[PDB]
């Protein structure tokens, strides 16, 4: 799901 990618990006960038 493309709509989940920015959540992962957010999580890994913390």
């Amino acid at each position, epitope marked *: *799901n*493309w*709509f*989940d*990618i*920015t*959540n992962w*990006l*957010w999580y890994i*960038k*913390k």
Partner: antibody, heavy 124, light 109 residues
Framework: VQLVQSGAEVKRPGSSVTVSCKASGGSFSTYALSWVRQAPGRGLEWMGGVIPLLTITNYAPRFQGRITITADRSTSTAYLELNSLRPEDTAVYYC??????????????????WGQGTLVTVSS | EIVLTQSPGTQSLSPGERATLSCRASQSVGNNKLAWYQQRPGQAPRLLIY???SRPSGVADRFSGSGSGTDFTLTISRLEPEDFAVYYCQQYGQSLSTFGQGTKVEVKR
């Protein structure tokens, strides 16, 4: 977050239109920007989106081959290009950015932020 | 492609009344990624509910979302004059996002 779109456009049948969306406030590169259109008297239709940092686009099958969505990190601007225009493409085109929850910037996928819309009229 | 059905397409109700609006999906919506938007004539849509039941801080608490799988509901506990508008559901549980065709909540007289 404020999204400001380019002004109304009249386009000839068979031409291509570019609509711009400039974001001011928050972060631009790490949040999903979509384009949604609404023909006169009709419903919302999701066309596609982009995640700028990763350059990952996602187009609705209905528009795959006719649309290009790009993002310019230097100007926090996203662009919609729609090709081979027909009268049926006459619509208000909105840019829509996903919201956040909490104070940490966690994205929610759903479209909290909307531009003012751009009317594209396809006509001779 | 997930088809979202909003039936009925119009509801005629009185100010102060409760409203329940249905969104039925042709297939299960991934992780209940179902949003509701309000749209008034001449205005951009506005997000009321996301993730089936989450409400953004600014949104009136008379709006609530419920449901899961294929069966979602937007509830307006008491209609204010500004609540007479069009309501769209949207799924974003797969890369192809779709909207319902909308339900217009209009004033019965």
């Amino acid at each position: 977050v404020q999204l400001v779109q380019s002004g109304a456009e009249v386009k000839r049948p068979g031409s291509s239109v570019t609509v711009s969306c400039k974001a001011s406030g928050g972060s631009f590169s790490t949040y999903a920007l979509s384009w949604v259109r609404q023909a006169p008297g009709r419903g919302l239709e999701w066309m596609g989106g982009v995640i700028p940092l990763l350059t990952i686009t996602n187009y609705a099958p209905r528009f795959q081959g006719r649309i290009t969505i790009t993002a310019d990190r230097s100007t926090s601007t996203a662009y919609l290009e729609l090709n081979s225009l027909r009268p049926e493409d006459t619509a208000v085109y909105y840019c829509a950015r996903e919201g956040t929850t909490g104070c940490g910037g966690k994205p929610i996928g759903a479209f909290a932020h909307w531009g003012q819309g751009t009317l594209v009229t396809v006509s001779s | 492609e997930i088809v979202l059905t909003q039936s009925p397409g119009t509801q005629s109700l009185s100010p102060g009344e409760r409203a329940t609006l249905s969104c039925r999906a042709s297939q299960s919506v991934g992780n209940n990624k179902l949003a509701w938007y309000q749209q008034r004539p001449g205005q951009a849509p506005r997000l009321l509910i996301y993730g089936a039941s989450s409400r953004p801080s600014g949104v009136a608490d008379r709006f609530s979302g419920s449901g899961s799988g294929t069966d979602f509901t937007l509830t307006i506990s008491r209609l204010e004059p500004e609540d007479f508008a069009v309501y769209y559901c949207q799924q974003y549980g797969q890369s192809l996002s779709t909207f319902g065709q909308g339900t217009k909540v209009e004033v019965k007289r």
